[PDB]
Amino acid sequence: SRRARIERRTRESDIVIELDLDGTGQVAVDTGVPFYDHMLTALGSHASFDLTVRATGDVEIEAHHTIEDTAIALGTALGQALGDKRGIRRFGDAFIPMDETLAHAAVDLSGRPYCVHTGEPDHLQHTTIAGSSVPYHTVINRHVFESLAANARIALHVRVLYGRDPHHITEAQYKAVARALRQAVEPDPRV
Amino acid sequence: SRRARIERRTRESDIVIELDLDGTGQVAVDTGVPFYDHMLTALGSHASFDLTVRATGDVEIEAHHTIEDTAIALGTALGQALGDKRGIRRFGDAFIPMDETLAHAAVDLSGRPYCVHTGEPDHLQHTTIAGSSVPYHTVINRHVFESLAANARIALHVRVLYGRDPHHITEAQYKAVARALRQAVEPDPRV
Amino acid sequence: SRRARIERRTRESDIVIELDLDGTGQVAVDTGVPFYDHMLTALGSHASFDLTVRATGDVEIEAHHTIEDTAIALGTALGQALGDKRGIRRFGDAFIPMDETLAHAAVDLSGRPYCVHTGEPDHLQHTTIAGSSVPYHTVINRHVFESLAANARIALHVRVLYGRDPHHITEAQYKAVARALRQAVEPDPRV
Amino acid sequence: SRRARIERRTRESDIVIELDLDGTGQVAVDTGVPFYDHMLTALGSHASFDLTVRATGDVEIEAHHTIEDTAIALGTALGQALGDKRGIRRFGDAFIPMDETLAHAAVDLSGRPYCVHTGEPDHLQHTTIAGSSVPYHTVINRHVFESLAANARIALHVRVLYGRDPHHITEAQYKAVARALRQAVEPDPRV
Amino acid sequence: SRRARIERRTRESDIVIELDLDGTGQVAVDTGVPFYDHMLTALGSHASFDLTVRATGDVEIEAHHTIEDTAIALGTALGQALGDKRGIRRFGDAFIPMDETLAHAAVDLSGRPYCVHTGEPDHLQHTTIAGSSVPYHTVINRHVFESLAANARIALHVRVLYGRDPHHITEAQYKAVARALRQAVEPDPRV
Amino acid sequence: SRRARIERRTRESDIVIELDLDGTGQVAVDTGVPFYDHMLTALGSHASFDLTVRATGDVEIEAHHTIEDTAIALGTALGQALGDKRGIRRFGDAFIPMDETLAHAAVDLSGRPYCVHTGEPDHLQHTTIAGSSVPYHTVINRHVFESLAANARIALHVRVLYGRDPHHITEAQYKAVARALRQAVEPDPRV
Numbered sequence A, B, C, D, E, F: 001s002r003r004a005r006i007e008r009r010t011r012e013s014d015i016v017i018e019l020d021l022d023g024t025g026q027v028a029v030d031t032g033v034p035f036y037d038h039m040l041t042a043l044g045s046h047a048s049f050d051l052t053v054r055a056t057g058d059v060e061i062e063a064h065h066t067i068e069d070t071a072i073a074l075g076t077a078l079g080q081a082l083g084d085k086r087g088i089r090r091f092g093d094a095f096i097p098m099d100e101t102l103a104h105a106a107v108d109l110s111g112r113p114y115c116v117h118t119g120e121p122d123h124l125q126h127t128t129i130a131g132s133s134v135p136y137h138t139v140i141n142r143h144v145f146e147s148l149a150a151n152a153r154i155a156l157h158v159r160v161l162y163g164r165d166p167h168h169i170t171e172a173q174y175k176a177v178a179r180a181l182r183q184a185v186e187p188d189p190r191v
């Protein structure tokens, strides 16, 4: 049984995460930031987690505090659900083509936080993905992955090999992180 | 049962493909272009497909029309054999060292055609691999992969990380595409 | 049963290797070069081999002859334990993040020796990792992998994508080679 | 008596080599690739070997598999004929001018395979030498020398100092390798 | 009879050399610097000298004084054993491949000291080869060859054509100097 | 018996050459150009030829016509003395250190004239070596070697690897050509 429920309340946001590592992709995400909900839904589904996230935060300022606090809490939930990590594969990686984009992630569930994020085109440091609700600044992608690795206490390396569309580039990275985790958390039949 | 038989007749060529995704490498290829037969035999075997290809075409002009038409028909056969794609891994990738060459392919069985082919040394845009029969112009490698992805309706990304011999460089790419497909078409035990 | 015992005596060193490909990481290494013992222990464990190495050699000169002779003998033991290679996956690869470092290895158990080692920062050609016993010159990493591939008769491609600490850079490569071998030697359920 | 007979049958080719190191240049070569026959005849004659090679292979694809398999088998025959290498010169080198070309080879019969091939003009990576039979792609020169060194288990270093004509450049290298071997295999009157 | 015994005592070191040019490789070297003993043992053996060297010196400072004084004394012993040089080949050269390294030396026994040492990679000016005893700084290679040429009163040209491992690069040069001397000191059957 | 006597009379010069390939260095040269006499005396001695050259020519103009005509006649004498070339080594090369200079020559007694002369420092295209008699312009070195190769009908490749003094640079090349010829003309005990 590899489950964790994390509640995180700050002046800026209120988060509840329920996570099961051995899920089948039963995912419900609601953070008030719909493009981030979309990315975390991709992450939960492609990782084959069961995952509920409910977050409310100060989106009148912008999405950053809610996005970061949610990734902190999700990271904590992952590190708590992994427990002593006995018997698992520990290493995982995945390539994700998404039309013109190719992204990759590799993970070591080592207990030492580390994140290296490389290759994202420079226009992503000032791109906004905007719809009819609160927008998502793609500069935050790096912060999401760093907050995840820091609080799960894992090494997470995320690379964009190439790509052009900012939604494809973002979504392929969240998917790659998701499939890398899925491989690394699985029981290893030889250990 | 994941099988397709495709017949494609044009003014330029006559093709029959019989494909089974759940094969054991039972492969017979005859296109009149023996180096291409060799590459498609590698592709069928390393993908663990059962695959028969019989093609006749206008090789007095050169191999291009037969090669492209065969890849179009093979692509169509793959997309037809995959059917609704329920329950499969969907993503697959593979590295293939071949002496000095290292190639890689990643696939997303997404239903949207896309191909990105990168890294092949520039001398491959005018190299000929010639024996005692119809020769094979390595410039056509890109067209084969694009025609495969376009007609199977999948994302296919093929990279040459490095290499020198044009037969190794070509053959390592066909093998990589083959092993990437093999992983992506397999049933996924968690979906 | 995929086991080999190799004894190799030269003027410079005396080596005994006992290797089992189908092990569970039962590893004991003693070469007189403690950082190399550490790397070969990583290699045996991450490959899920059972592996005993006992080497004594001319470390008053420096570690090179003992290190190389041991890798030659270990390579021979691998190629002997693999036997006719019937029914195995044959290809294997692995990414290994280790804090700031990311390394990768890909293997083809082809029967033709080949090694390509790329990306290691230039300071590793004159770095020493020194403790209270015989030191380890990281310039030797390349020679270890080449001697392994040459005597097992396999293609081994080892890459450092990036990194800074010489112990992380070294150890991530030995781990990557180890996990790539583990994948490639495994029985392939479809062949 | 320093003789070896090697038979090598693969799906791609059937090879028989009979080699005598202490010959007088009695050489008969028939591989189905007449420019390669010419180069191996040069090699056998300039090395003062007696050498018979008979190879048949899949030249409808192109010459590569027959060429490589023959060099593998010839390498094995050399390493077998050298036996324990007692009493020989061990090191050998030779310069070969051939009109505008100057090539060189150096050998160490060390028991550790190694090949370094440098200086060949870049146009040789896509040059074809074509007559009325199966052609020879000069990109294969490097692969021939590497396969020879790998299977004889010797260090072979081949350099083109300069040159322009691809037949002179190729033939001067095979001659240089041949004369370097001839010197290195000879009995050394002081050991 | 071409023999010399040289004793050289300084405040820093005490050296005894016994040299025979017409030897069979009977070599015993003990200087307190085991990697240097290894190189001088290579030099004596590959030159087909009989050579005893016994040196003790101030290795608490470092190896330099013992290494240089020994090469001075060995040079003097060579120049004394050559005597009037009547009837010898006088010129000698040798290429030495050592895995990835290729080194070369040429000699003229002219009676005028000269040394030109070129091609050694720049990292060798600050590389240490260290084991469990006194280490060897590869910056000293040049000084060894210069001291040898200066005291034997010969022209000695040592080149590294290419290479990477500092032990291979060093050892291939000492071997090349050794085989070049062996050729040059031999009786010339036509003079 | 490998001897030739050549007389060559032109409006510009009168030459007599007597050459024996199987000599012991009995050399007498008198051309009216004393530095050229010195170089041809080096050439005859280091080649172990017996060689008499007596030339008189229009040195009031400068040395060029006498120097070139003598090299033409000497070349003709070499090609005539070699006869059918049966049973000889055919290939020869030699390195010649001369203080700071290192030169090299390689020869193929092929019956096709060819000369490639490379590496000589650019100041040699306008250097004069002057004493109390007729001077020698070092620009002529290339013409001497080309005239030798053209009239003996051999491939001659002469290289200066490095050097500074024009007399050392010149003399080391003539010596290298001489020792390369000496090796190439010798009977080959295996053919």
Ligand SMILES: N[C@@H](Cc1nnc[nH]1)C(=O)O
Pocket (backbone or CB within 6 Å): A012, A064, A065, A068
């Ligand atoms: N919410 C955290 C971190 C943060 N605040 N603004 C942007 N990032 C804090 O208040 O320090």
Ligand SMILES: N[C@@H](Cc1nnc[nH]1)C(=O)O
Pocket (backbone or CB within 6 Å): B012, B064, B065, B068
């Ligand atoms: N066969 C197709 C595509 C094609 N024709 N020549 C090269 N490529 C056509 O006729 O358009």
Ligand SMILES: N[C@@H](Cc1nnc[nH]1)C(=O)O
Pocket (backbone or CB within 6 Å): C012, C064, C065, C068, D110, E167, E168, E171
């Ligand atoms: N031990 C082997 C290889 C080697 N020696 N020094 C460094 N590498 C030999 O003696 O040739």
Ligand SMILES: N[C@@H](Cc1nnc[nH]1)C(=O)O
Pocket (backbone or CB within 6 Å): B167, B168, B171, C110, D012, D064, D065, D068
């Ligand atoms: N014949 C060998 C090597 C090779 N195949 N194509 C080019 N080189 C094999 O099948 O792996």
Ligand SMILES: N[C@@H](Cc1nnc[nH]1)C(=O)O
Pocket (backbone or CB within 6 Å): E012, E064, E065, E068
């Ligand atoms: N031993 C000699 C030369 C030397 N001293 N330190 C480094 N080299 C001397 O005392 O001058």
Ligand SMILES: N[C@@H](Cc1nnc[nH]1)C(=O)O
Pocket (backbone or CB within 6 Å): F012, F064, F065, F068
């Ligand atoms: N002596 C020959 C060649 C020559 N003349 N001046 C420089 N070189 C002739 O008259 O052509």
Ligand SMILES: [Cl-]
Pocket (backbone or CB within 6 Å): none
């Ligand atoms: Cl990659």
Ligand SMILES: [Cl-]
Pocket (backbone or CB within 6 Å): none
């Ligand atoms: Cl050279």
Ligand SMILES: [Mn+2]
Pocket (backbone or CB within 6 Å): A064, A068, A143
């Ligand atoms: Mn923040």
Ligand SMILES: [Mn+2]
Pocket (backbone or CB within 6 Å): A038, A167, A171
């Ligand atoms: Mn989307």
Ligand SMILES: [Mn+2]
Pocket (backbone or CB within 6 Å): B064, B068, B143
């Ligand atoms: Mn087309």
Ligand SMILES: [Mn+2]
Pocket (backbone or CB within 6 Å): B038, B167, B171, D065
């Ligand atoms: Mn092939």
Ligand SMILES: [Mn+2]
Pocket (backbone or CB within 6 Å): C064, C068, C143, E099, E168
């Ligand atoms: Mn070594």
Ligand SMILES: [Mn+2]
Pocket (backbone or CB within 6 Å): C038, C167, C171
């Ligand atoms: Mn460690």
Ligand SMILES: [Mn+2]
Pocket (backbone or CB within 6 Å): B099, B168, D064, D068, D143
């Ligand atoms: Mn090949």
Ligand SMILES: [Mn+2]
Pocket (backbone or CB within 6 Å): D038, D167, D171
């Ligand atoms: Mn020819």
